């Protein structure tokens, strides 16, 4: 199959574009989003239209498409 583009938008209003083949686990991307654009990993959470994205998951498996957006948030704690 053919590769697709994916936007990752931080809640600081920062879109980070990405290219990947559609059958690939998102681990490759998730960790790259932390490494590049320095950030934690065990302090954030990714969601595609509210659906919790897991590392296991793959674009095709999430019915993702070209130029679709992934939201990423800070982990959030409250008393």
């Amino acid at each position: 199959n053919d590769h697709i583009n994916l936007k990752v938008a931080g809640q600081d209003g920062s879109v980070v574009q990405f290219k990947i083949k559609r059958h690939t686990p998102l681990s490759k991307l998730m960790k790259a989003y932390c490494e590049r654009q320095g950030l934690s990993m065990r302090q954030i959470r990714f969601r595609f239209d509210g659906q919790p994205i897991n590392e296991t998951d793959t674009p095709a498996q999430l019915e993702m498409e070209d130029e679709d957006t992934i939201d990423v948030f800070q982990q959030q704690t409250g008393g």
């Binding site: 065990r42 939201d71 008393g79």
Partner: protein, 225 residues
């Protein structure tokens, strides 16, 4: 009305609380993942991290599917503030594949900076109603959600929402109050618990350390006594 805290349970609980492998996988389903780290947030007087609440809001919802009980859709936690901050367009979208209206109650868990709270859309009572344990009012939240409804209606069922007759408000000294420093996310969950069971509210504080332990088993096994 209280389920007992049987020996079998206490022993599995105290186990998952002990300082061990913090990244251990522990519990799945709901596309949620619950670790010893996540679990840890239910110990003593720890601040409940999002993952726990979302999980509870799924079971609260999964249960509201059984007979003689108001059907419920629950949004994840990040919903509210992503709306409040980014507007509608941002969350269009998160409700593709749910007719929000074909349900009896909506559960909105809210994260306010350093603080948990809950808002409830009761389609059948016709009132968006907000719940803070510390007693703080958030009439804004209601006014925002109502805007959601209006907007969603246009986007899903291609027609304006019938705003007529609806109430928006917040609860005060009329229910149970926080009474400490960290049991908010707790109150929020168990607040919803009574709501979802059409049951009245009834509990106060001391019911919390119990509910805390109780929640843990409830979580791991998915099952809410």
């Amino acid at each position: 009305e209280f389920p007992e805290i049987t020996e079998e349970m206490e022993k599995e609980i105290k186990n998952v609380f002990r300082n061990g492998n913090q990244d251990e996988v522990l519990s799945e389903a709901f596309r949620l993942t619950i670790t010893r780290k996540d679990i840890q947030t239910l110990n003593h007087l720890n601040w409940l991290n999002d993952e726990i609440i979302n999980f509870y809001m799924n079971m609260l919802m999964e249960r509201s599917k059984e007979k003689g009980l108001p059907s419920v859709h629950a949004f994840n936690t990040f919903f509210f503030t992503k709306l409040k901050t980014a507007g509608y367009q941002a969350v269009k979208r998160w409700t593709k594949k749910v007719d929000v209206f074909s349900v009896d109650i909506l559960l909105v868990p809210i994260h306010l900076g350093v603080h948990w709270c809950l808002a409830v859309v009761d389609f059948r009572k016709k009132n968006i109603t907000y719940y803070d344990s510390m007693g703080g009012i958030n009439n804004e939240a209601c006014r925002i959600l109502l805007q959601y409804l209006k907007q969603e209606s246009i986007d899903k069922k291609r027609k304006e929402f019938d705003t007529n007759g609806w109430q928006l408000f917040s609860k005060k000294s009329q229910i149970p109050q926080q009474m400490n420093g960290s049991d908010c996310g707790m109150f929020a969950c168990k607040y919803a618990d009574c709501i979802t069971k059409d049951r009245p509210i009834n509990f106060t504080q001391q019911h919390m350390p119990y509910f805390r332990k109780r929640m843990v088993w409830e979580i791991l096994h998915r099952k809410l006594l």
